[PDB]
């Protein structure tokens, strides 16, 4: 897995158009103030263990989010972070599990729609730990 | 080289803190509207031909800018896109070259300062061609 964590003043998104692999979603729009925007590409290597990958992901998000003491998390699918991607079915599963585990761990979570073209607005805080990239293993 | 090209309503930035390799500059604050925000990671392979990499990158930016009829370009150093980076000195050279060549080809260019932690704000348009990733080889 590849992840970009952006410590943000806000993140808003608006689904605009479906791709062929668009997911049913219960929020085509969303806004979250002061958050860790986690842009995630679920990778082919992640298919070896999708459940372990979601745990590995939450573990790393916690590591950074505890270091910033942020409780607000956006799970934002972002395929462009990798050139060797997982299947859409597996990616959706991992992203949904990440949201589930984080919610279970008392985090405030917003998940952007998988497989939709989305307008978005983000403001990065710009401190030395405000943009971090992480490679994640199960 | 890895680039992510985002068709944006705006890109704004504010350099906040220096790193070890912060470039010396006056342009520490900036904004461009209706722009192609080009997040660029210069890679180890690019060291073999820095000028050629720059020319290749400009060619791809032009293809997208011409397809979307965009004239405003932001050159944004973004190491996060790649796990196999060139040296810092190589990276700034190539980024500076991309900026100078785009300028000589008639584009309005703003380059975000290299080696500074920066706050930034962006708004992605969200149409199907608004977020494109490209590998550049030279
Ligand atoms: C394009 C860009 O602007 C947009 N933001 C986009 O990335 N769209 C992707 C992801 O939301 C999702 N998707 C498919 N596979 C994956 C994967 N392995 N990991 C994460 N997302 C995936 O499906 C869309 C088309 O590939
Ligand atoms: C901090 C982070 O969130 C910020 N946004 C950042 O990416 N900072 C990078 C670039 O500005 C630049 N830089 C150094 N090497 C490279 C490279 N190979 N390619 C591109 N830029 C580089 O130097 C910084 C640290 O590597």
Numbering used by the authors:
A (entry chain A), B (entry chain B): 5 to 142
Original paper wording:
We have been interested in a D-aminoacyl-tRNA deacylase (DTD) fold that is present across the domains of life in two different functional contexts: as an N-terminal editing domain (NTD) of archaeal ThrRS, which specifically removes non-cognate L-serine mischarged on tRNAThr, and as a freestanding ‘chiral proofreading' enzyme, which removes D-amino acids from tRNAs in bacteria and eukaryotes. Both share a striking structural and mechanistic similarity highlighting a common ancestry. Here we show, with the help of structural, biochemical and biophysical studies from three distant organisms, that the substrate specificity in this domain is determined by a differential remodelling of the catalytic centre at the RNA–protein interface rather than just the presence or absence of catalytic water as previously proposed.
To understand this intriguing mechanism of cognate substrate rejection in NTD, we have solved high-resolution crystal structures of ApNTD, as well as NTD from Methanococcus jannaschii (MjNTD) in complex with non-cognate and cognate substrate analogues L-seryl-3′-aminoadenosine (L-Ser3AA) and L-threonyl-3′-aminoadenosine (L-Thr3AA), respectively. In the case of MjNTD, L-Ser3AA and L-Thr3AA complex were crystallized in C2 and P21 space groups with six and four monomers, respectively, in the asymmetric unit corresponding to three and two dimers. However, a clear and complete ligand density was observed in only chain A in the case of MjNTD co-crystals and therefore only this monomer was used for analysis. Second, and more importantly, just the presence or absence of the water Wat1 is not sufficient to determine whether the substrate would be deacylated by the enzyme or not, since Wat1 is also present in the MjNTD+L-Thr3AA structure. The lack of activity against L-Thr-(Ec)tRNAThr by MjNTD strongly suggests a role of other determinants besides the presence/absence of Wat1 in substrate discrimination. On the other hand, in ApNTD and MjNTD it leads to a loosening of interactions of the threonyl moiety of the substrate in the pocket, which would not allow it to be fixed with sufficient rigidity for the nucleophilic attack to take place. While this loosening of interactions is very striking in the case of MjNTD, in ApNTD there is a subtle relaxation.
